[PDB]
PDB file of C-alpha atoms and ligand atoms in Angstrom:
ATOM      1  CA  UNK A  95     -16.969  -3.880  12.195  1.00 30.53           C
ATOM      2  CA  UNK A  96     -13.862  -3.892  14.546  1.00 28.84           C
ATOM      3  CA  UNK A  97     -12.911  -7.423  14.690  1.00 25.42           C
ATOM      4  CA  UNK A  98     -10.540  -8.759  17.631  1.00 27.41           C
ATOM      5  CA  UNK A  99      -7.096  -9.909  17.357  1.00 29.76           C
ATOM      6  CA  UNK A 100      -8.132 -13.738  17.342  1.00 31.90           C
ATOM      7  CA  UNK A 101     -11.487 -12.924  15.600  1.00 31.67           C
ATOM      8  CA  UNK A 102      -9.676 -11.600  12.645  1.00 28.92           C
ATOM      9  CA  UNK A 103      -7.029 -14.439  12.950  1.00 27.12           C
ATOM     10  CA  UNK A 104     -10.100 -17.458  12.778  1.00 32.09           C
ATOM     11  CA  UNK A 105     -12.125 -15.586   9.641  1.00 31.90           C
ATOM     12  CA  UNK A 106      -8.673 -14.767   7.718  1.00 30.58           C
ATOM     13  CA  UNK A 107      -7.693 -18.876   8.256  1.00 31.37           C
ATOM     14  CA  UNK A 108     -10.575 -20.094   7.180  1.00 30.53           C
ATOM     15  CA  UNK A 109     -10.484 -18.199   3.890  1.00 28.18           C
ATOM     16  CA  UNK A 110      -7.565 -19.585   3.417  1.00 25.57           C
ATOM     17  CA  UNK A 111      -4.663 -17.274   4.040  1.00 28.19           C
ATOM     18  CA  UNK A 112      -2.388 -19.082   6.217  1.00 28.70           C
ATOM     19  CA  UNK A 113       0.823 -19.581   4.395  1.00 28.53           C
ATOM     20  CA  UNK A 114      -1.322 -17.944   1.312  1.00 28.91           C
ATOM     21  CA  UNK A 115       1.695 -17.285  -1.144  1.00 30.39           C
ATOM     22  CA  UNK A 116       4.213 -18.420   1.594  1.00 29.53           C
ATOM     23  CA  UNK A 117       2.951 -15.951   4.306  1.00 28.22           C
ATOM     24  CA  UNK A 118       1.570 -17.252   7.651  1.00 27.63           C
ATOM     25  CA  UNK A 119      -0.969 -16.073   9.316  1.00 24.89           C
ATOM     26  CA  UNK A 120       0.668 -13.742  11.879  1.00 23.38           C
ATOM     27  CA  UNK A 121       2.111 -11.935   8.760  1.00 22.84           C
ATOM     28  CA  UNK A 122      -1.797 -11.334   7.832  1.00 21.54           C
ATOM     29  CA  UNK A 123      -3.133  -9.942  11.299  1.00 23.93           C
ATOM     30  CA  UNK A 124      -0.098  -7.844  11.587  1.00 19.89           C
ATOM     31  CA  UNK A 125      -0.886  -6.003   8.033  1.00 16.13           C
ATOM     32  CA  UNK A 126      -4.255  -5.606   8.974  1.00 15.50           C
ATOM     33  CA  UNK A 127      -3.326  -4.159  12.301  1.00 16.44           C
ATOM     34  CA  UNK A 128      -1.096  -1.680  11.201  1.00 12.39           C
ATOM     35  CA  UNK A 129      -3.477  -0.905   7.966  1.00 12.05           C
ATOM     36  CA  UNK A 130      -6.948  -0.553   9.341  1.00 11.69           C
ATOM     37  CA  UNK A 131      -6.602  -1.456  12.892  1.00  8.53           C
ATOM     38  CA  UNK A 132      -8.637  -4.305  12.436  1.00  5.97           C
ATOM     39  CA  UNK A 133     -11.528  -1.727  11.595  1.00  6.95           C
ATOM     40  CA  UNK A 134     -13.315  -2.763   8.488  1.00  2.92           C
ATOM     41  CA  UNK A 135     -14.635   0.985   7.767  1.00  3.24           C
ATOM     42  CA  UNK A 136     -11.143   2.190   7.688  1.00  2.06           C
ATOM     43  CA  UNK A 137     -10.557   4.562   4.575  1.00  2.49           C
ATOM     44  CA  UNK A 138      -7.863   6.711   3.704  1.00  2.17           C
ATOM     45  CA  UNK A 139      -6.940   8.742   1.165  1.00  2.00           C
ATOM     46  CA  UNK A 140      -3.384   8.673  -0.693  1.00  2.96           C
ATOM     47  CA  UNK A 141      -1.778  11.356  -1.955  1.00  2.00           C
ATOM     48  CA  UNK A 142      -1.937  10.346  -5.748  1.00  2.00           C
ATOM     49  CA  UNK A 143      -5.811  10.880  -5.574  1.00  2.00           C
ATOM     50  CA  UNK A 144      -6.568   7.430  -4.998  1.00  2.00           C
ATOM     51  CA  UNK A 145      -7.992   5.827  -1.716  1.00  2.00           C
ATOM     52  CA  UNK A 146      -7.132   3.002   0.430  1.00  2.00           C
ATOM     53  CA  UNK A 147     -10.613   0.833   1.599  1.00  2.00           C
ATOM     54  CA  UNK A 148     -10.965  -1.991   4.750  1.00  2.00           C
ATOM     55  CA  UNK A 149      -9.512  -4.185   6.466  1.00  2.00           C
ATOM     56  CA  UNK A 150      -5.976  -4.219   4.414  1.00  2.00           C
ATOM     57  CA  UNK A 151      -6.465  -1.237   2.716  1.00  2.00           C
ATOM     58  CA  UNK A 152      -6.552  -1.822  -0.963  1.00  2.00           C
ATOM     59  CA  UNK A 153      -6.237   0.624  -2.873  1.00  2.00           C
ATOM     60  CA  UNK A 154      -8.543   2.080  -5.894  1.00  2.00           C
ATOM     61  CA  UNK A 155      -5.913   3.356  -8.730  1.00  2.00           C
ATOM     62  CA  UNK A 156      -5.516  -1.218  -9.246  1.00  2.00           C
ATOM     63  CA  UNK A 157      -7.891  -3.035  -7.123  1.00  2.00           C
ATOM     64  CA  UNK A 158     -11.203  -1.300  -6.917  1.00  2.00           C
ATOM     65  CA  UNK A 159     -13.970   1.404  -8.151  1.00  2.00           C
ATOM     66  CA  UNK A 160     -14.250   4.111  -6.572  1.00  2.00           C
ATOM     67  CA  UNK A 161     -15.112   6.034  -9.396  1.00  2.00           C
ATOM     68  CA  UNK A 162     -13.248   9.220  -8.346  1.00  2.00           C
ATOM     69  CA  UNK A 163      -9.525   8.034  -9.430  1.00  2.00           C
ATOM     70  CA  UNK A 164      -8.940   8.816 -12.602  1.00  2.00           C
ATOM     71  CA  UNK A 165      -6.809   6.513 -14.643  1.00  2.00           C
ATOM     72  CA  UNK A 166      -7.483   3.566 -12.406  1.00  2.00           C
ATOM     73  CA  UNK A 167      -7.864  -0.157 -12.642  1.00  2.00           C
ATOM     74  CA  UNK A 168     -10.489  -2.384 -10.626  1.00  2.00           C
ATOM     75  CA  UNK A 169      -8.505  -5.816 -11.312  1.00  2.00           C
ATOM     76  CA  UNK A 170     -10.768  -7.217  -8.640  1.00  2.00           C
ATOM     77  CA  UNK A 171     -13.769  -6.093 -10.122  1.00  2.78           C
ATOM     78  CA  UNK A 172     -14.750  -4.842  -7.315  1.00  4.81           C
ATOM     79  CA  UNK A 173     -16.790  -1.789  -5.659  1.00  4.20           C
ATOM     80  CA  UNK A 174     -14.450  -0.137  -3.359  1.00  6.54           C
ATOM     81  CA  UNK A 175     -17.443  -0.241  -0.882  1.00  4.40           C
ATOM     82  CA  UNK A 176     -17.397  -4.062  -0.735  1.00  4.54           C
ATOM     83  CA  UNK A 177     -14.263  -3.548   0.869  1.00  2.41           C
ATOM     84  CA  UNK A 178     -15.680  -1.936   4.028  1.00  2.00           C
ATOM     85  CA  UNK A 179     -18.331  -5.033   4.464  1.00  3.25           C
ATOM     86  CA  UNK A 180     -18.306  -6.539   8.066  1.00  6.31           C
ATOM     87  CA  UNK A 181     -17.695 -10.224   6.072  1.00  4.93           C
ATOM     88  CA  UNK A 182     -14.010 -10.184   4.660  1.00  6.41           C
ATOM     89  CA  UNK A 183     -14.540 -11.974   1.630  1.00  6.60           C
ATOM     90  CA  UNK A 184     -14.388  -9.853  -0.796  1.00  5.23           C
ATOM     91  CA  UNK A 185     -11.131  -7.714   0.915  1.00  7.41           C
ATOM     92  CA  UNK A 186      -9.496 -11.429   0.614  1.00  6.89           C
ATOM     93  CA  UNK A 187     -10.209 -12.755  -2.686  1.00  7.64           C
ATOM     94  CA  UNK A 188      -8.772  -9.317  -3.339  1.00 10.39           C
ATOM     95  CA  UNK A 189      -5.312  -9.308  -1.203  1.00  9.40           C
ATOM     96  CA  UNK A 190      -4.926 -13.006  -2.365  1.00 15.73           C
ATOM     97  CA  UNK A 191      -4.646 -11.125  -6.315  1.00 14.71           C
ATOM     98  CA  UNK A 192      -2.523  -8.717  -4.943  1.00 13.19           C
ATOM     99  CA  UNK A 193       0.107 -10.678  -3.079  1.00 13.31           C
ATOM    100  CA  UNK A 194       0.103 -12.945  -6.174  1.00 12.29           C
ATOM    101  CA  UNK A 195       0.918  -9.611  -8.363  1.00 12.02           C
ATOM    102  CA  UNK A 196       4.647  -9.951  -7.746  1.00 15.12           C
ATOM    103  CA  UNK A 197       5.925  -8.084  -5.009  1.00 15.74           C
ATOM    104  CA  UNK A 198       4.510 -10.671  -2.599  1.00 15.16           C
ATOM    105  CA  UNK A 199       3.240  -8.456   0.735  1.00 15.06           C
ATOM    106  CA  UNK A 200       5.766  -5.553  -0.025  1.00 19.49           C
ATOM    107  CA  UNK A 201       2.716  -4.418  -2.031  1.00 20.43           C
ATOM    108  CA  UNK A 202       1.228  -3.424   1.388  1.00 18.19           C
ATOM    109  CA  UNK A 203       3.615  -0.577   2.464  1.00 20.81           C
ATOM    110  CA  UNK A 204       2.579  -0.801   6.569  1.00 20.98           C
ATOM    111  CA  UNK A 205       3.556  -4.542   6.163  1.00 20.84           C
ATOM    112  CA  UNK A 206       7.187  -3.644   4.918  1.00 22.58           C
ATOM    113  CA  UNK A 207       7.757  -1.277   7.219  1.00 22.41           C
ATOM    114  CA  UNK A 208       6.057  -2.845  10.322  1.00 22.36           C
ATOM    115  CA  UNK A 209       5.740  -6.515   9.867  1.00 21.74           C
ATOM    116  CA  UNK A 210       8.210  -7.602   7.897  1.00 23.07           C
ATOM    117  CA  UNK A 211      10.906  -9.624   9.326  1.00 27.80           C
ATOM    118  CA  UNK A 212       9.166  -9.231  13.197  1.00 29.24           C
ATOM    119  CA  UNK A 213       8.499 -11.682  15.294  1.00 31.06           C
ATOM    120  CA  UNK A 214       4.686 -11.913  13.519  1.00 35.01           C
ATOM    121  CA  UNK A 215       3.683 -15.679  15.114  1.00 38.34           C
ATOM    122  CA  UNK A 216       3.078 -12.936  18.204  1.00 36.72           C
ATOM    123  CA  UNK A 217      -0.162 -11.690  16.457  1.00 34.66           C
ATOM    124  CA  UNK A 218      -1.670 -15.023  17.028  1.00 39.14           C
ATOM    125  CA  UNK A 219      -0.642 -16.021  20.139  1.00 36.76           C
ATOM    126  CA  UNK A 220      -3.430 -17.106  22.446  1.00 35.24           C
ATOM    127  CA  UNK A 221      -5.725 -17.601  19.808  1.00 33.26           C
ATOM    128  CA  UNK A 222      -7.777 -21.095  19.127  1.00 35.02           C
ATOM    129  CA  UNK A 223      -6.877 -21.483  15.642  1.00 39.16           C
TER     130      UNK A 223
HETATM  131 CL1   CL B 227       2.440 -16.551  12.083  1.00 37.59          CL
HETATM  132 CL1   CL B 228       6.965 -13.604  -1.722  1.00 37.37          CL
HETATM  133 NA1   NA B 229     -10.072   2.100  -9.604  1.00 38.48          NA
END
């Protein structure tokens, strides 16, 4: 699914990641922009073997099976598959462990280098939230 700007905006709110660990909303649709262009399909593979699945692509050497990245993790328990679902539940419960693992949204490198410190209330203007 390719979810609008204000689409994305209403499901992400109502699972409850406005201000989610500090980071509003705009913060949230700006990540997703830049990491899967709102596209839930969106997968890409990373250079250390591992792949990056959905809407925020998370990645499966921590987050999620794959079961083709050796040495890896699934902390959220999680087929990598559920990731690309048209319902973003299971890509939230997900970021919300991941933005809670330390690093706060510098764990997403597109946020860092795209969202972070911009003017991100802009990603939800216009939208009936
Ligand atoms: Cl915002
Ligand atoms: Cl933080
Ligand atoms: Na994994």
């Amino acid at each position: 699914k390719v979810f609008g700007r204000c689409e994305l905006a209403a499901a992400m709110k109502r699972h409850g990641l406005d201000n989610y660990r500090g980071y509003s909303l705009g913060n949230w649709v700006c990540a997703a922009k830049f990491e899967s262009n709102f596209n839930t399909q969106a997968t890409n593979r990373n250079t250390d073997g591992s792949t990056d699945y959905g809407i925020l692509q998370i990645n499966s050497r921590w987050w999620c099976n794959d079961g083709r990245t050796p040495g890896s993790r699934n902390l959220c328990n999680i087929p990598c598959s559920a990731l690309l679902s048209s319902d973003i539940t299971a890509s939230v419960n997900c970021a919300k462990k991941i933005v809670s693992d330390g690093n706060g949204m510098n764990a997403w490198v597109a946020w860092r280098n795209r969202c972070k410190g911009t003017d991100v209330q802009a990603w939800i203007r216009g939208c009936r939230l």
